[PDB]
Amino acid sequence: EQTPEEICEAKPPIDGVFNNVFKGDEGGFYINYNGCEYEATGVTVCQNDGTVCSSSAWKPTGYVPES
Ligand SMILES: [Mg+2]
């Protein structure tokens, strides 16, 4: 019995590789995955130019995106 934001906040962190990664205004790396926004944490590796990044712990931000 949770709001969608709550559902996102409770999601487990993900170890993985994603495309369509978008950089934050503050240098954070973000993805929209299964209706939740996640932020890359710990060691993050991206292509110099282009979307793809790997992170051992993509963590939900609690934001429910429309992008
Ligand atoms: Mg948690």
Swiss-Prot record:
It comes from the Viruses. Consists of 3 domains (N1/D1, N2/D2, and CT), a glycine-rich repeats and a C-terminal transmembrane segment. The N2 domain interacts with the F pilus, whereas the N1 domain forms a complex with the C-terminal domain of TolA although with low affinity. The pilus and TolA binding domains are independent of each other in stability and folding. This is Attachment protein G3P. Plays essential roles both in the penetration of the viral genome into the bacterial host via pilus retraction and in the extrusion process. During the initial step of infection, G3P mediates adsorption of the phage to its primary receptor, the tip of host F-pilus. Attachment of the phage causes pilus retraction bringing the viral particle into close proximity of the host cell inner membrane. Subsequent interaction with the host entry receptors TolA (low affinity) and penetration of the viral DNA into the host cytoplasm. Residues 1-67 are annotated as: N2. It is found in: Virion; Host membrane. Disulfide bonds join C8-C36, C46-C53. Interacts with G6P; this interaction is required for proper integration of G3P and G6P into the virion. Interacts with G8P. Interacts with the tip of the host pilus. Interacts (via N-terminus) with host TolA. Belongs to the inovirus G3P protein family.
